[PDB]
Design a protein around this ligand. Sequence first.
Ligand SMILES: Nc1ccn([C@H]2C[C@H](O)[C@@H](COP(=O)(O)OP(=O)(O)OP(=O)(O)O)O2)c(=O)n1
Ligand SMILES: [Mg+2]
Lengths: 545, 394
Amino acid sequence: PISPIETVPVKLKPGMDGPKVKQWPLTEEKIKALVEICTEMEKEGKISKIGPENPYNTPVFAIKKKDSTKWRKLVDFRELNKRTQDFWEVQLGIPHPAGLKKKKSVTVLDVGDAYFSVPLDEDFRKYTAFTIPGIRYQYNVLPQGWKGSPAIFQSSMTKILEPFRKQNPDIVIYQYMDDLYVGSDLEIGQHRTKIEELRQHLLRWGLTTPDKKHQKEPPFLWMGYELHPDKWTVQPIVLPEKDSWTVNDICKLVGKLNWASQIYPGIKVRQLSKLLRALTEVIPLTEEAELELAENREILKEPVHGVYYDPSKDLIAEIQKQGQGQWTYQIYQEPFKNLKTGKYARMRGAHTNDVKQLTEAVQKITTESIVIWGKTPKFKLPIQKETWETWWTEYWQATWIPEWEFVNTPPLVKLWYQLEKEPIVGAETFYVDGAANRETKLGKAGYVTNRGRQKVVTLTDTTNQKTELQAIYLALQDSGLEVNIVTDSQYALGIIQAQPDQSESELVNQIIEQLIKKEKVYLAWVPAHKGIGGNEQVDKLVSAG
Amino acid sequence: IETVPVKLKPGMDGPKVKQWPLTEEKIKALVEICTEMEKEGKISKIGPENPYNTPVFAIKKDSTKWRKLVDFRELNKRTQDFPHPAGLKKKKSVTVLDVGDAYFSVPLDEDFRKYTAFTIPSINNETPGIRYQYNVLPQGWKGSPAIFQSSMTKILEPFRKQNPDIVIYQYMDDLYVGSDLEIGQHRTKIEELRQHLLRYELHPDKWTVQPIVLPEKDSWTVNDIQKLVGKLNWASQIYPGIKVRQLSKLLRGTKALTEVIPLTEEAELELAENREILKEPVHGVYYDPSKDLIAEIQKQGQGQWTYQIYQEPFKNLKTGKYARMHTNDVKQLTEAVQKITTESIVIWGKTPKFKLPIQKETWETWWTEYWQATWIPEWEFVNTPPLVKLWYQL
DNA sequence: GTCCCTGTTCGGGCGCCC
DNA sequence: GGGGGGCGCCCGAACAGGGACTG
Ligand SMILES: Nc1ccn([C@H]2C[C@H](O)[C@@H](COP(=O)(O)OP(=O)(O)OP(=O)(O)O)O2)c(=O)n1
Ligand SMILES: [Mg+2]
């Protein structure tokens, strides 16, 4: 049946016209599938035969549904989609079972042939012209393949449920496309009554709810999960086992894993992701990668569930450090009863350290808790209050972590060295510098010390900033456990003062090692070329090119 | 009440900003507020055929009462262009009133409404977003003071006549009311005006400018002098007139950083004159309204924040200090940004563009939890050279 | 001006949902 | 096989912006 909802006014992008595209050849099994579908839709006024008034055409096909049995008619509107106006998508995200509260009674409903129940704007029907190889039709309803269809259906669906929702404020209806999860705190019979009210409300608006997709008993299949009354589970995740992985194969494995990490603690994909730095390209696994893959494989073998959300309790998130910029977290309310889990692993910044990254993790989780439960969680972090305090003093930026409590569970996040705030008495003073020729790429790094030591190192295929980092490296390399280094490189001073423990740069990594080995380091800055000794002396030494 | 046609600047489409996630509290408020706003015809539901969007959130001012706030910064940037009292920055007491509810009485050009579209999120995405659009002058759009200016004049006219010593300035949803009354006098005047409009608190003169100031110590190390020469070399750019040659002459050779250096009497005096060249007011800096105010903020630590407002580099219009205290940097930084904006609106009736010393994500995760203003300045995020933060140190 | 380096965004794969 | 919207993850490509440099 077709909804008596008002159509949504749609137009083409200006100066453009509808699609004219040859109908590619189809399987015979699919044509029988399609005429079966078309002859029926046509009797229901969902599609209309057209003539030569309609110049347009757009290819059609059909794939099998999850069902084994019924076909889904589709239309490669890729071209019309280029030429259709912009919509504002209204689907802002994906409901998560961890955000569901416990309900006395639950129902899951799906709408029968949902799109084909929402009428399409009259003035736009022309462009939806297609051909079944052989009859020529246009759409009077939403086509599956148009880019307007999801936003229009979702919005239309939302209009339709608005009355029921106002009339029934305390019946909760999660609404994903045409899928509905309906929860009530009613005894089973009063609930079933309410469901029948709903189904008939939908029917009045042309959206049927076939009993075949009407779930009445736990466990409910919903949004890719099984929902039990006290716990939820993800429908089994089956990783490939192709012992000759390709870039496409990897991407599917990284994808299934990230999806898996929402309830599986300890998933890592750094070493897998690292691999893919076109799609048919086969890549050899690294050791680190396969070792990882196996670790995940062992994780997935275990049985795990999530729980539902009690708003009367707190949201707690604890974060584990996984190493190499990797982090897992567990969000719960009662210990060892996870709401959900997750991983942070985004590398951002050429140079960084573990406290920045922890702060980024806290941020991601905060944003995500806010989407899912609408509030920030309390944090349990493997970082001592003193460590954070130091970093929030030492750092020239506004940084902040919400309410949180330390947890002794290693690897504890630390600062791996601390630059001195004041120059070090009885420490050799190095005046470092570097210069590099733009044209030849030759350059020199080196230093001059208050004790009379001087050294220049010649470099090849280098850059100015590199030569300044090289000069500092050189000074760390030839200094005692305590060193005063004076640089004129704003660049270098900015990197090192940020106290990184990791870098994309091999050279900065080599430097970090030196800074961790040293016991006191002090970095002072001076303006370049201003006769300031002995930045002056090392400048002459280094600038012979 | 017929409407004023309103255009976008040429070659410019309307805003298309994604809504950010809101807390349950804020959504509950927005839904309640929007319901009532829809009952009174002030907003209408719209579908997804309207391709425009603009974020909304909500602030709680100790109250039971939330305030919707639509982030119209793009729309304002994109709206065809449209009174500044120098005497307002002098008043002993200035009060800020929210005259935003006044705009809901003037309807809005039908062909413009589409660009005011906003979307309300649901907790845990239980539903698609619910999209609205405005039918009256929106609060937070720069068009709403303009269109309503005419009416705004008629309303304050007799209050200004009867109080010609009181100065009333309007910026966006805001009414700035400055008086030279002892507090209480001023207060009773403020409630005289608000009661007059149905039919806390500022003091612009006690505002401070933060000079650049030099260390005073009796023995100087090479390190001390090197930092000093570095600080002055940069201040040379702001104030021509600052000299380092004599001090820089003490850093002849390659000395140990902790060596003490007796100050030669030349250098001793050069350091003295410099000190005064800092207190001397900066020269040759004219506020240009055709260019926006830039504001830099630097975290000085221990709840101390410095800032400078300038239109061109090193040509500061004002330079200040903002001091506070479970210390929260994000909370302090947004309190600073609101403080600096307010001062900027008072002095030049233009909102500044902030260069914020914070990670973009950290700022976007929390700033609305401490916002209290009806306007929102534009901003960009910067990784400030740890040099500049020592230049302005106290 | 150029070159360098760093940060952001955006668009392309893949995952999952309908 | 092949179409669509959403969110997620990774990646690399453009481009933005400040600093250092050439004379
Ligand atoms: N691969 C897919 C799956 C779905 N949809 C859209 C159009 C569908 O109508 C709607 C809902 O999907 P269902 O699987 O519920 O399909 P229908 O509602 O059309 O059919 P059924 O009777 O099998 O439920 O989402 C789509 O465009 N592409
Ligand atoms: Mg269905």
